[PDB]
Design a protein around this ligand. Structure first.
Ligand SMILES: CC(C)(COP(=O)(O)OP(=O)(O)OC[C@H]1O[C@@H](n2cnc3c(N)ncnc32)[C@H](O)[C@@H]1OP(=O)(O)O)[C@@H](O)C(=O)NCCC(=O)NCCS
Ligand SMILES: [Br-]
Ligand SMILES: [Br-]
Ligand SMILES: [Br-]
Ligand SMILES: [Br-]
Ligand SMILES: [Br-]
Ligand SMILES: [Br-]
Ligand SMILES: [Br-]
Ligand SMILES: [Br-]
Ligand SMILES: [Br-]
Ligand SMILES: [Br-]
Ligand SMILES: [Br-]
Ligand SMILES: [Br-]
Ligand SMILES: [Br-]
Ligand SMILES: [Br-]
Ligand SMILES: [Br-]
Ligand SMILES: [Br-]
Ligand SMILES: [Br-]
Ligand SMILES: [Br-]
Ligand SMILES: [Br-]
Ligand SMILES: [Br-]
Ligand SMILES: [Br-]
Length: 308
């Protein structure tokens, strides 16, 4: 009989399960009992898991989910509390990294975007009445400003992760499995994120290996299907000049974007971003830009150096 495990958390949780199941040694030992991610699970589903899934688990692999997110019922502390006596609950870091695409965020406070990501610097430009043609002419100046600020950006990305490692989203329990220092050490040589919250296969393989190491597996047991890339739906493009800090960058101006598995060239993509922001009231676009910018001074700096 294989032991039973579940992986609970963000979109990254099912992806981690896919990756772990692709290792032959791991799949020999473990059977996944699937849990819906924290942003999908219904009340009916989360109640049933506490009663029927969790008490039957040998391993609960989870990302921190605060009580404040959707209530106690969905929280990692509450769920792991229902593990059986001889069970093991291991927390895995929520991966978020804006270092490749420091102008990109999610449009909180604005209509839902069908692609899930918007360019916040474009929001700031729209508020300033910078037209889309001017913005396109200034992509290199924006990228130059970001490149001057690359260490500050990285330092902040690392600090954000380290603070969360303390585990306030998991009742103060320090995160068991993390990759912060790996990300900082490798981010310029290898593409580790397609979007701020979608690790590439390379990063997913590293976090899955660290889970297997935490379970006591020997190095010689650890391998994964290299063809798997679970969070590849949308791929943000790095800005000109800034992209040249990274080893994997090419000799074109800016790579095509991928959104919902479809490619769009950088110019029509950024023109659509302008048009999307222009649909909303300018005051609301401004409130959005101010929220994003408040803890990201490089974004207001780039807008100033390029356009003011
Ligand atoms: C992160 C999440 C799983 C739970 O959040 P939480 O338990 O309340 O605590 P977190 O610190 O993770 O999230 C706090 C906020 O800071 C953001 N954040 C998370 N990690 C971060 C980091 N290292 N640096 C900067 N910002 C970060 C989160 O996106 C979240 O933003 P929001 O409140 O505007 O949604 C979920 O709320 C989330 O942010 N993801 C939404 C996107 C999505 O659907 N992806 C997978 C589903 S969760
Ligand atoms: Br799953
Ligand atoms: Br998946
Ligand atoms: Br799976
Ligand atoms: Br519900
Ligand atoms: Br909590
Ligand atoms: Br526990
Ligand atoms: Br959205
Ligand atoms: Br141009
Ligand atoms: Br977290
Ligand atoms: Br680390
Ligand atoms: Br490392
Ligand atoms: Br790469
Ligand atoms: Br990869
Ligand atoms: Br175990
Ligand atoms: Br050996
Ligand atoms: Br591997
Ligand atoms: Br890519
Ligand atoms: Br690459
Ligand atoms: Br690139
Ligand atoms: Br391209
Ligand atoms: Br409109």
């Amino acid at each position: 009989q294989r032991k039973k495990y579940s992986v609970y958390g963000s979109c990254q949780a099912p992806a981690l399960a896919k990756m772990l199941n692709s290792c032959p040694t791991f799949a020999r030992d473990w059977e996944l009992v699937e849990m819906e991610p924290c942003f999908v699970a219904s009340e009916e589903q989360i109640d049933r898991h506490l009663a029927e899934t969790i008490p039957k688990l040998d391993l609960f692999l989870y990302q921190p989910v605060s009580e404040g997110y959707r209530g106690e019922k969905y929280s990692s502390v509450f769920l792991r509390n229902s593990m059986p006596p001889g069970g093991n609950a291991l927390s895995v870091q929520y991966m978020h990294w804006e270092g490749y695409h420091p102008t990109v965020n999610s449009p909180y406070g604005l209509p839902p975007h069908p692609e899930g990501y918007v360019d916040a610097l474009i929001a700031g430009a729209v508020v300033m009445d910078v037209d889309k043609e001017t913005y396109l002419r200034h992509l290199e100046e924006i990228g130059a400003s970001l490149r001057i600020d690359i260490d500050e950006i990285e330092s902040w990305c690392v600090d954000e992760l380290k603070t969360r490692e303390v585990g306030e989203n998991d009742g103060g329990k320090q995160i068991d499995i993390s990759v912060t220092d790996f990300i900082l050490a490798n981010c310029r040589q290898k593409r580790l994120f397609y979007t701020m919250n979608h690790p590439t296969a390379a990063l997913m393989r590293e976090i899955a290996a660290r889970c297997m190491l935490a379970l006591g597996y020997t190095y010689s047991d650890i391998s994964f299907d290299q063809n798997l890339d679970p969070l590849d739906v949308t791929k943000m493009s790095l800005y000109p000049i800034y992209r040249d800090c990274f080893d994997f960058s090419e000799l074109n101006r800016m790579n095509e974007y991928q959104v919902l598995y479809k490619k769009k060239a950088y110019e029509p993509y950024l023109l659509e971003q302008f048009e999307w922001f222009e649909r909303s009231p300018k005051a609301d676009v401004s409130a959005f830009f101010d929220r994003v910018a408040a803890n990201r001074r490089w974004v207001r700096t780039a807008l100033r150096r390029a356009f003011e």
